[PDB]
Amino acid sequence: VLQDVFLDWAKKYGPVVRVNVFHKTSVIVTSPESVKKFLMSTKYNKDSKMYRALQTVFGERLFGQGLVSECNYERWHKQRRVIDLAFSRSSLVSLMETFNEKAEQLVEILEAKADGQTPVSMQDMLTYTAMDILAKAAFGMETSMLLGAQKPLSQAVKLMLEGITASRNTLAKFLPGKRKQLREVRESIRFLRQVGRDWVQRRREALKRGEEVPADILTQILKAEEGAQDDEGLLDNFVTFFIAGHETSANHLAFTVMELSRQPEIVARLQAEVDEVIGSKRYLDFEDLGRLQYLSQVLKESLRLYPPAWGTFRLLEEETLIDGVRVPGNTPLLFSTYVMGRMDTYFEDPLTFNPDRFGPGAPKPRFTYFPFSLGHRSCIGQQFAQMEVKVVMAKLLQRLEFRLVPGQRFGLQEQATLKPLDPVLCTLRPRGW
Numbered sequence: 001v002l003q004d005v006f007l008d009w010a011k012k013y014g015p016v017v018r019v020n021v022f023h024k025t026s027v028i029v030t031s032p033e034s035v036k037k038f039l040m041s042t043k044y045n046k047d048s049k050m051y052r053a054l055q056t057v058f059g060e061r062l063f064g065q066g067l068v069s070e071c072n073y074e075r076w077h078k079q080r081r082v083i084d085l086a087f088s089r090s091s092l093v094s095l096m097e098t099f100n101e102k103a104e105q106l107v108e109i110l111e112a113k114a115d116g117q118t119p120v121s122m123q124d125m126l127t128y129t130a131m132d133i134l135a136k137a138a139f140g141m142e143t144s145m146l147l148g149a150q151k152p153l154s155q156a157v158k159l160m161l162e163g164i165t166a167s168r169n170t171l172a173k174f175l176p177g178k179r180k181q182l183r184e185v186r187e188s189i190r191f192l193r194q195v196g197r198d199w200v201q202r203r204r205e206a207l208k209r210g211e212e213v214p215a216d217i218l219t220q221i222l223k224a225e226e227g228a229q230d231d232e233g234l235l236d237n238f239v240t241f242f243i244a245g246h247e248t249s250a251n252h253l254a255f256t257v258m259e260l261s262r263q264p265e266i267v268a269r270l271q272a273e274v275d276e277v278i279g280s281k282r283y284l285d286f287e288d289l290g291r292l293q294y295l296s297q298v299l300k301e302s303l304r305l306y307p308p309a310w311g312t313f314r315l316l317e318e319e320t321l322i323d324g325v326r327v328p329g330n331t332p333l334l335f336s337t338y339v340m341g342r343m344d345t346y347f348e349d350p351l352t353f354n355p356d357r358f359g360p361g362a363p364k365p366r367f368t369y370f371p372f373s374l375g376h377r378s379c380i381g382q383q384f385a386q387m388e389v390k391v392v393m394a395k396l397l398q399r400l401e402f403r404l405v406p407g408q409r410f411g412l413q414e415q416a417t418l419k420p421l422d423p424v425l426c427t428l429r430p431r432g433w
């Protein structure tokens, strides 16, 4: 686990460490003051030379110049301003029905298997859940993965994210069947962009027949592409949203369930809170979410130890002194919430999963914790995701208990994002016996 090697190095060699595992020499920077300086100013922008790995994968255009991978400030800001409209408080409030719907479908599907005996991959079920939410919420589409459909589509995502991590030259070293990987990954990326054309087409047709579709992310990514010569920019945003809008939430759900399977005390307390704030309501209202304070803590603590988005890069344009170390200009700086969250200098007993760290009255972590990143390039979807995941967790806590199958490991793996090494295979029982 490469991130653990970074952690080791940050601990042993200081807040600024030169690394060589990527195609360009980079430096990992782990003091909270440098985080503040570089992430909190629009003077510092993403390094396009690192972001090319998302832009294009094995030669095949993927994220392109969409909202995540465009690094130029002006070009980024023009699109960010348009797309922000799909994330207003009212927009998000109007997604509650979709969150509630898909979370309820997941729960019923799990309860149907809850005989303490049938193994279910919670990683897969949570990815199906997150994908059906995103497709419906952002694009008006029903993927129905919870109901067994669109398997090829989640496959294609897995292949291409594997591809991104595999592209690392120091890792993309010397094995034989790198040829098959290339074709499968290229083919997956083309598949996904074609899905995109189909879905955009659907929307365009609806509009031509005079339907009034409520404005969603799709509306705004179309709006951001008005004067375009072709649809490539549009499809870059489709891919951006499709992936960024479900993969990280699915990873974060899967980590949280995996970790809770060994935290019976925390679980009991989550269950009490659920019963208390939502009782036996079937659906959550938006006001309910704010009261799931303890669940909120658990989710936060889950992101400290297990941040799916584990790093971000900024271009250091000119030679500069950083925590005492001279860093050459034109150097990619890596900031890692994964690393900092596991340093005992920033967190006491860092490997202990302790939700009280985010308890009320506790001081907020100060530039040592950023699972949605910070500053102008922080996650546009943070509130959407925090809503989404509390809805899913609250529903599960209300109705089900999980036992991890013996032999399942607690480890992580990097496939672009971090996610559980194992599929979080569980057996399930209805809550209470």
Ligand code: HEM
Pocket: 067, 068, 080, 138, 240, 241, 244, 245, 246, 248, 249, 252, 307, 308, 309, 311, 312, 313, 370, 371, 372, 373, 376, 377, 378, 379, 380, 381, 382, 384, 385, 386
């Ligand atoms: C728990 C889930 C999520 C986590 C941990 C997460 C994390 C973050 C982080 C750390 C970045 C990267 C910034 C970089 O390259 O350094 C990112 C940006 C972004 N995320 Fe999220 N994200 C999540 C959910 C979502 C959701 C639900 C959506 C969309 C509905 C979304 C959309 C995006 C987009 C479009 C960007 C690029 C924003 C910009 O640069 O203006 N994310 N996110």
Ligand SMILES: CC(C)CCC[C@@H](C)[C@H]1CC[C@H]2[C@@H]3CC=C4C[C@@H](OS(=O)(=O)O)CC[C@]4(C)[C@H]3CC[C@]12C
Pocket: 021, 022, 023, 024, 050, 051, 053, 054, 068, 164, 165, 167, 168, 169, 170, 243, 244, 247, 248, 308, 309, 310, 311, 312, 313, 416, 417, 418
């Ligand atoms: C887009 C959404 C899902 C958020 C993604 C957030 C993380 C997971 C992204 C942001 C920055 C991304 C990388 C950029 C650049 C690289 C270099 C590349 O190796 S290299 O040989 O091409 O230098 C390996 C993948 C890696 C580390 C990335 C993994 C994935 C990465 C950390």
